[PDB]
Design an enzyme around this catalytic site. Structure first.
Site, mmCIF file in Angstrom:
data_model
loop_
_atom_site.group_PDB
_atom_site.id
_atom_site.type_symbol
_atom_site.label_atom_id
_atom_site.label_comp_id
_atom_site.label_asym_id
_atom_site.label_seq_id
_atom_site.Cartn_x
_atom_site.Cartn_y
_atom_site.Cartn_z
ATOM 1 N N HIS B 39 0.808 -1.055 0.046
ATOM 2 C CA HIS B 39 0.357 -0.101 0.017
ATOM 3 C C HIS B 39 0.692 1.305 0.241
ATOM 4 C CE1 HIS B 39 0.375 0.911 3.864
ATOM 5 N NE2 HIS B 39 0.192 -0.317 4.691
ATOM 6 N N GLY B 141 2.485 6.315 11.023
ATOM 7 C CA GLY B 141 3.891 6.506 10.184
ATOM 8 C C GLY B 141 4.906 5.380 10.153
ATOM 9 N N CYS B 143 3.948 1.705 9.236
ATOM 10 C CA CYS B 143 4.147 0.256 8.406
ATOM 11 C C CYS B 143 5.487 0.255 8.324
ATOM 12 C CB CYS B 143 2.940 1.068 7.877
ATOM 13 S SG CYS B 143 1.391 1.371 7.762
#
Ligand SMILES: O=C(/C=C\c1ccc(O)c(O)c1)O[C@H](Cc1ccc(O)c(O)c1)C(=O)O
EC number: 3.4.19.12
Lengths: 298, 296
Positions: B39, B141, B143
């Site tokens: 993503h 953030g 990820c």
């Protein structure tokens, strides 16, 4: 809300094994010096009533075996600073980080890299308790493991492990060899004092609960620093100072809850419990986050 | 008895930043491949109904900016494997440790190196919950942050962070891009199922307590396996299987306490609480130490 430790890589590259006769423990290799607990030079017999100045005078460089993984480091000088032995070695550690030696206060937090005979085993986040001990899970042979904080690539070393106390907690020095707490590096009778809860950290953690949307413990009331500290007395909490209030100032401005308003919340929680409720998914009040820790992660 | 994370240095040397358009997250640089959540190629809007094959076919190598500290790495190929993007780069990571990819099961523990925009921020020790989520401490953030175990200097990567669920918990994949649990890399209404306690881990930790000289919670009772599970499920404890009983065999032999006798003790602990006492260093029943962890 997870406790987190600092990434340990900068410290991992400084851990060595120091051997003096039959005793092996961990040392910290920074530039061309290896730092380790001075009781490495003691035989179990010596530990009874050591004269460290004398015991070290009888030692020579050849008495110390320092190993960094596969490589022996040759000791070319030895000295003591307080309770820390300093071994000058032939090679500068090429992995030396930017670093400082700092002394922390009770209630402040740091990470410990637990090591067994020079090899890093695990890392955890600690608080220095008000009684100057560390509640640590520890390997056999963790002496000389160090505690640290990291700020923008600079490692601040604050703790070196020296001893386990009978209650299972741990005692140590700063990296200049000064003990935390009323302990000595001798095999004598010693025990941790009665411990207390770190009040300013509990408050910080309640601020974190509010930032994370858990607000049920907030009430309409305020209290006074004096009235609170008498309640703190009875539940074995450290007294809260005007110093602590100013430190919580940012969280009070950020959340809208004045510190003495949060103290009114904490006083009520202490007197009446949580009524089956939970705070950050916890039924117990956490005291190993500092105000700084909370601002950092939030 | 403290939950320890693995020393993170071997993973810190593999963390990079991956940017595609306006989206930036963490990647894992092993040999000449950078692994990150697919993503990264989505905007926030795309997340509602992303068509990953369509979004990816429109990208070229130069659309991916990879930064390893102050050095840009040149991407020279890309492909998608399930939910992870694999960026082939110019340069093999000189700091690649011995490593392997492993898919774990709920109840298993691991360390997570939490990172923001490629820079390590903190490390913590985790269990994969029975509902296939992690109770993490995600920075904004984080990820692409990864979970791992280290055994004799080989890093087993088992988790990559993809999604925050509405309850504040975290969902992700193994390093082959297959999600843990029923979650998807799409902003849907998906929610963690009811979490349960990892029973086999609590019993292993009770054995740890006995090995270290705590015995106050033991009693004179035993239980059948089925009676234990009927009671424990009323406290939202996971059922205990015969595999779990076998797994606890060694600790049973070490302590001379039959597994079903320890189950009887747990039943009473759930009924009574701790009455102000502690077991190891804790006032709660700890369920993030595995039987493998306890033997060590
Ligand atoms: O991260 C993005 C992707 C792109 C984005 C990229 C640049 C922007 O300026 C912007 O507003 C959005 O969105 C997320 C995907 C995601 C990332 C991290 C999470 O923790 C999560 O639950 C979901 C979402 O809406 O579900």
């Amino acid at each position: 809300f997870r406790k987190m430790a600092f990434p340990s890589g900068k410290v991992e590259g400084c851990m060595v094994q120091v051997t003096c006769g039959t005793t092996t423990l961990n040392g910290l290799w920074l530039d061309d010096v290896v730092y380790c607990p001075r009781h490495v030079i003691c035989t179990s017999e010596d530990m009874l009533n050591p004269n460290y100045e004398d015991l070290l005078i009888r030692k020579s460089n050849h008495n110390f075996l320092v190993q960094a993984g596969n490589v022996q480091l040759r000791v070319i000088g030895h000295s003591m600073q307080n309770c820390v032995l300093k071994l000058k070695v032939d090679t500068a550690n090429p992995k030396t980080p930017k670093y400082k030696f700092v002394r922390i206060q009770p209630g402040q937090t740091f990470s410990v890299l637990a090591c067994y005979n020079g090899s890093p085993s695990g890392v955890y986040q600690c608080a220095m308790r008000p009684n100057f001990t560390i509640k640590g899970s520890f390997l056999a042979g963790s002496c000389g493991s160090v505690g640290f904080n990291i700020d923008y690539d600079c490692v601040s070393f604050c703790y070196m492990h020296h001893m386990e106390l009978p209650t299972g907690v741990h005692a140590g020095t700063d990296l200049e060899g000064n003990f935390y707490g009323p302990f000595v590096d001798r095999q004598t009778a010693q025990a941790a004092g009665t411990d207390t809860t770190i009040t300013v950290n509990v408050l910080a953690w309640l601020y974190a609960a509010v930032i994370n949307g858990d607000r049920w413990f907030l009430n309409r009331f305020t209290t006074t620093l004096n009235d609170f500290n008498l309640v703190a007395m009875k539940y074995n909490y450290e007294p809260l100072t005007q110093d602590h209030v100013d430190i919580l100032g940012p969280l009070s401005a950020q959340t809208g809850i004045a510190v003495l308003d949060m103290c009114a919340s904490l006083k009520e929680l202490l007197q009446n419990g949580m009524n089956g409720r939970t705070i950050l998914g916890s039924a117990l009040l956490e005291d190993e986050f500092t105000p700084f820790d909370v601002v950092r992660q939030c």
